[model samples]
Target: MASMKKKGSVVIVGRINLSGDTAYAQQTRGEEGCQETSQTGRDKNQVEGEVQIVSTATQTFLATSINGVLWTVYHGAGTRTIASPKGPVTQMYTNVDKDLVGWQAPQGSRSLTPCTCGSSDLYLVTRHADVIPVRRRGDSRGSLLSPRPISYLKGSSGGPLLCPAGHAVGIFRAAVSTRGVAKAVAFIPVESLETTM
Candidate 1:
């Protein structure tokens, strides 16, 4: 459990929708305050690129496959639909910063894996890995020119690696590399993550 503090600009990476009336009700009142009578019969598409800096502290997880993406851990519920652009874009788990809370021991130590993405080579910290160090592989200019290996398993194809304070630390690039490292991987800084979102 990490403590997420709201900061930075967040863009909806994909398309979403809301039954116009329901959206109006939810936006005007709160989700709990909405009632069936509030239905306005106007359905509206939530265009992609919508920007908002959500303040509430919540935990959400995104799982992406070759076909599509899925949000598996939203604590709140409603017909208020939300999504990002299609495949491959990293998922942002709004307020849940897993790194901040600290990883739970033995299991945490085992989650680091190597990258298999092919384009860039690196390692990845497992879903349960504890304490990820912050280090740079090379000079900032050279790092931009070529794909640098990750110093630790932080970010991968999933999304941003966030600290307990909900500040993004890195972006998950790949799961494992050909080096045979289990969760060997790489990550970009939070500044980079901000630019992408």
Candidate 2:
């Protein structure tokens, strides 16, 4: 078994749901004492994003897919509903300064395949082996840019931005687009992962 998570193989999909009652609960009672109820008429919003397992010891993973809504929902109701292919995550970590979100790995089978990406400066390979070119966006080491913008619907967020050594250097975030024409994509670098823990 692989002792540590590596590029490509560590990537997984996560689905988060924000319950309708969480908002009112937070309003009625502050974040400290918010209570969640399973009311029949309440609705919820479900969002999906990719994730990368950074550690197996603590079952910790990284992603840039979380927003205020999902964070609020997580704190309000815990991760009982934060579904992933493995299972429901147990915890959420939001104290990091990086543009990354952390989660405890869900309980499930752990049959992961080895990485299949090759090193490249012109292109980055995703967990699914989908390739995207690299775009020159200044010399910022904090983030990576896509060559010519790609659809966020490609579900690349939270996926690894592999380094030339076939290691994860960053995690996909979002894209910059105008009138449906995406011109650039943003990815958070892995340098912060060391301090994030």
Candidate 3:
């Protein structure tokens, strides 16, 4: 069991999304909302850069491959689509300040084996394979939480939680910042995340 984290395992990785823009944009707009000259000559339906998924267990696997080039990106904000109460459908959305990061493949070969053990058997790692001092936080909502306190600033999301096998068991999904330190810590089960991969 790990607890009372002394350091952060993963560093903040600034990223950019090279692909999947058109679709992500389309999903942001509501069919009802369309182009129209705004009071400032701006198109009412004008869109902006989108939120890129920087971290994922599956992508991490790819980045460590023989020639992984999973180049990353995160614009910090963007638009999205949603359904209203009950009507014509197509509600719009905008991500104000979302932080995320990812791994790469080029200059590759260094990768994780993805720990294949229980909660009692893994070591959290950070940059340069640096070990993140962690003990254990215990399970939650019937699922394992494994919280590791971090200095949450602006960009501490979408990082990984490494295990004994030098592989990530999960990614840092959420957090909250404080005066000198951030109580930022969140997790989703590896099994649950892996299955989607």
Q: Summarize candidate 2's per-residue lDDT along 1-197 as a digit string, tens digits.
A: 66873221122222221223221101111211111111111112222332222212112233333221122111122223343444334345553344455554333322112223433343343433355566435322222344334453244455555445435555555556667656665655444443444
Per-residue lDDT over 3-115 for candidate 1, one digit per residue giving the tens place of the 0 to 100 score: 86422111122211122322110122232212211232121223321111111112112221110122212222111233222311223333232221111111101121112
Clashes (N, CA, C under 3 Å) per candidate = 35, 0, 18
Tens-digit lDDT track for model 3 on 1-197?
47653211111122222134222111322212211111112222222221212222112210111112111112321111111122121112222232222333322123334546655443332222323444335430112234333432123233345555445465444444445354434443344433433
As a TM-score, model 3 comes out at: 0.37
TM-score: which is higher, 1 or 2? 2
RMSD of each: 17.4, 15.0, 16.4
Off by over 4 Å in 3: 1-109, 121-130, 138-154, 176-180
Candidate 3 or 2, higher lDDT: 2
lDDT of each: 0.26, 0.36, 0.29
Model 1: weakest 10-residue lDDT segment is 100-109
The estimated TM-scores of all candidates read 0.26, 0.43, 0.37
Alpha-carbon RMSD, candidate 3: 16.4
lDDT of 3: 0.29
